[PDB]
Write a protein that binds this ligand. Structure first.
Ligand SMILES: OC[C@H]1O[C@@H](O[C@H]2[C@H](O[C@@H]3[C@@H](O)[C@H](O)[C@@H](CO)O[C@H]3O)O[C@H](CO)[C@@H](O)[C@@H]2O)[C@H](O)[C@@H](O)[C@@H]1O
Ligand code: BGC
Ligand code: K
Length: 418
């Protein structure tokens, strides 16, 4: 029976290994998935994911900082990644969701999603900007990396994805054009795309794209009340309890939500309340699933008993599946509650739910379902948020970008970093 502190470092280190020992070997990029038993129904073990690899380059910086790898080891790996990303398919400067690791060519995420994915590109840029800042004051080779990252950053054509409108579209294809037809309106996980779009010095957006598009001219404001907690953001399709918990993770890995506010919300309090509602649902456990309680909580999108599902509170959304990234990546918001789950899982369940790349993606005690499987997009925010809770690493780096601060000012945000 180990201490939280011992467990914390074991979990952080092993989770980081998804992105190191687990990386696709040619590219260095994060695999979409890793299945311990070697069985890949889609034969896609070496398909890498642009968004999750953004998480992973952050994780590499955690690795250098915690001594998991040397500074030099980290640098050479990031160099390899950036080389790959310089030759990979880009679609008005945005990477696709999926790439073949060995070649850097697109794998369509469904037939018509065969071009750019601006949302996944934004998670890659959040992470690559942290790397730019980390190296900006090092040696000749570190600065040339920082510059090549700056170049990739500046070539993302955020404005292209407006398609002439006051909003950003998620996708664009060479041949299918705008047929995916997903204009990105809030609230969902995608805030960082609009912030980066405003920040871009070469291909930015005017403020109306954010206010009329993301914010729906104010219709993003809501009042979702559960367990005595209020969300003031209109969580898309989740007006009872808020969405899957990762919405309070992905856009907040670099962007620091502490003290972040604008006319639509106080992001700290809304992110926190999102977590506390999620946890409370698991404590009340209305569907009477096995294992739900204060030592085992957190619903988010992940592998599921019948495949993959966007788990969340509500009788229609909670499938008896707990996914560790929900509670663990919530460490900066709810450290003691996130540690409570982490400790129970490690001390009492590790032989079922803990593996070489940290805790597995999802489990159901109701169904005795304990797949030895992992997803980049679930492991990455665990490593990153655990380190943010510890030291602020990625927040410090990201928030230091002059362009991030300008973009936040342009969109009428408040934050101490400004
Ligand atoms: O396939 C498009 C895009 O979907 C992203 O999911 C969004 C989800 O989008 C769903 C869409 O996928 C679904 O087919 C239709 C009808 O069922 O409705 C939309 O809501 O919406 C939520 C709420 O805004 C987002 O959190 C979620 O991420 C995938 O993430 C993305 O990878 C994919 O390209
Ligand atoms: O990217 C995360 C997951 O999204 C799901 O919709 C897809 O079916 C999976 O291939 C993928 O692992
Ligand atoms: K197979």
């Amino acid at each position: 029976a180990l201490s939280a502190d011992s467990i914390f470092n074991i979990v952080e280190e092993q989770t980081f290994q998804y992105f190191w020992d687990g990386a696709e070997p040619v590219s260095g990029m994060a695999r979409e998935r890793y299945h311990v038993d070697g069985n890949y129904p889609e034969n896609d073990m070496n398909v890498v994911t642009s968004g999750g690899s953004g998480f992973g380059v952050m994780a590499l910086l955690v690795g250098i900082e915690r001594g998991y790898i040397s500074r030099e080891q980290g640098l050479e790996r990031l160099m390899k990644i950036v080389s790959f990303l310089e030759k990979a398919d880009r679609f008005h400067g945005a990477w696709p969701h999926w790439l073949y690791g060995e070649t850097g060519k697109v794998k369509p995420f469904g037939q018509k999603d065969n071009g750019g994915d601006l949302v996944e590109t934004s998670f890659m840029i959040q992470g690559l900007l942290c790397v730019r800042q980390y190296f900006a004051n090092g040696n000749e080779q570190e600065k040339a990396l920082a510059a090549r990252i700056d170049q990739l950053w500046k070539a993302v054509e955020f404005s292209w994805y407006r398609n002439g409108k006051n909003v950003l579209y998620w996708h664009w294809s060479p041949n299918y054009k705008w047929q995916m037809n997903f204009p990105v309106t809030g609230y969902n996980e995608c805030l960082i795309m609009y912030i980066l779009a405003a920040a871009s010095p070469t291909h930015g957006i005017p403020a109306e794209v954010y206010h009329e598009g993301w914010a729906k001219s104010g219709a993003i404001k809501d009042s979702i009340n559960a367990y005595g907690h209020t969300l003031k953001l209109s969580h898309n399709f989740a007006k009872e309890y808020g969405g899957p918990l990762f919405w309070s993770h992905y856009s907040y890995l670099g962007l620091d939500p502490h003290g972040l506010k604008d006319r639509y919300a106080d992001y700290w309090e809304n992110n926190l309340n999102h977590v506390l509602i999620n946890r409370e649902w698991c404590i009340q456990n209305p569907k009477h699933y096995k294992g739900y309680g204060p030592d085992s909580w957190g619903l988010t999108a992940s592998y599921s008993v019948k495949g993959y599902a966007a788990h969340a509170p509500g009788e229609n959304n909670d499938l008896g599946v707990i996914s560790p990234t929900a509670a663990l990546s919530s460490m900066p918001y709810t450290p003691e509650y996130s540690k409570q789950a982490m400790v129970h899982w490690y001390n009492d369940m590790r032989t079922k739910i803990f593996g070489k790349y940290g805790f597995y993606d999802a489990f159901s005690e109701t169904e005795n379902w304990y797949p030895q499987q992992y997803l980049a997009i679930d492991q990455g925010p665990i490593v990153v948020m655990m380190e943010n809770y510890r030291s602020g690493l990625l927040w410090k780096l990201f928030m230091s970008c002059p362009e991030v601060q300008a973009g936040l000012k342009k969109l009428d945000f408040q934050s101490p970093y400004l």
